[PDB]
């Protein structure tokens, strides 16, 4: 039950088939053609290694997360560099792994919660871009009761 996964720069990763099908993106390529090696042109090696770790950890359980508290392990798993986090957010989206998407996007969401923005601003390097008077007009308009 062994399947070959080929990084965006070749790389290894011989994972158990149940663990690979966990990505729909893959499960559907494994049905196009036999596909022996499996070319993943978007996910590099560093990232895919994480992706496999996450999948091998949740292999025996899936179902119903969504807006459920991020579990303790995923919390650690995700104590990563910010850019690395977004890189996971893309792999999850590319490999279509719902669970990894939920938990990475939710962790990003939790960062934005409770900021000024001016915090939200520092945190993600976003361009101020409201001219002098532009502010008040959006700030009174964005005061949710």
């Amino acid at each position: 039950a062994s399947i070959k996964l080929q990084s965006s720069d070749g790389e290894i990763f011989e994972v158990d088939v149940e663990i690979a099908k966990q990505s729909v993106t893959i499960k559907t390529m494994l049905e196009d053609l036999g596909m022996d090696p499996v070319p993943l042109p978007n996910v590099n090696a560093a990232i895919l290694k994480k992706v496999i770790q996450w999948c091998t950890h949740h292999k025996d359980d899936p179902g119903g997360s969504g807006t459920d508290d991020i579990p303790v392990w995923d919390q650690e798993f995700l104590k990563v560099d910010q850019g690395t986090l977004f890189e996971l957010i893309l792999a999850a989206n590319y490999l279509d792994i719902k669970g990894l998407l939920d938990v990475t996007c939710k962790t990003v969401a939790n960062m934005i919660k409770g900021k000024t923005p001016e915090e939200i601003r520092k945190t993600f390097n976003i361009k101020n871009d409201f001219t002098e008077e532009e502010e008040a007009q959006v700030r009174k308009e964005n005061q949710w009761c």
Partner: protein
Amino acid sequence: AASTLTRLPIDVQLYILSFLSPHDLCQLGSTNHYWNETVRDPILWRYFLLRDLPSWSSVDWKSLPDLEILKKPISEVFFDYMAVYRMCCPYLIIQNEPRFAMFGPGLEELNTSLVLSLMSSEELCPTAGLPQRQIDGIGSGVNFQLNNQHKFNILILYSTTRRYSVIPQIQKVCEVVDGFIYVANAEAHKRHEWQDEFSHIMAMTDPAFGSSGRPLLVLSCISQGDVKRMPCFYLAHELHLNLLNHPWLVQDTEAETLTGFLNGIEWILEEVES
């Protein structure tokens, strides 16, 4: 888009946004540009509305969204889902500064101008209506603020009409307004064509326009204190007001002192509610 977070796909950006709350959403929106635009994405709100629609335990007549057949269909194959979210969220009130159409013979026959008194009233902070919408082809109306809380807008129609006969610009007013104000002349010496005025009221209060049971405040009005007055019960009864079966109130008024206006306005505001 120099921001790692701004570059992500919209599908993925909205997914992130799906875990936030309206309050959060506003802070993120305040980063400006894209985020302001995207935080209000019609799609994000559809999702919120569909979710949480099933969590509410009340629905009044004033808040049951159009065909759920329409709320809940294919994304494309309406909105402003954000707005609809608000009417339906029973813990939320959408905001509104009422506007009222003021017309009536009383505006021109009295020897003292009511309008020119309302305009000179320290107590109501009358101020030119801002072009910010509020325009039509008649102007912006005049904003007033009642004792530093409720703000409202009046459109004073000095000439309505040419049976129906409602002028077209006037019908644009009849649809967007929340209530009507009719300035009757209560001066005892005045001869009336009651039937005309009642018709003329009707014409404007026509339900083909903004339908609803919009309130009608009628200001039984005289130039000043010493002028002999037609009692309002008799005035109300001459305009056949019993027939309108939709809220109305005849409030006595004096152009000079505005005696009576403030009670009248208070009534009309309290009538319009949601």
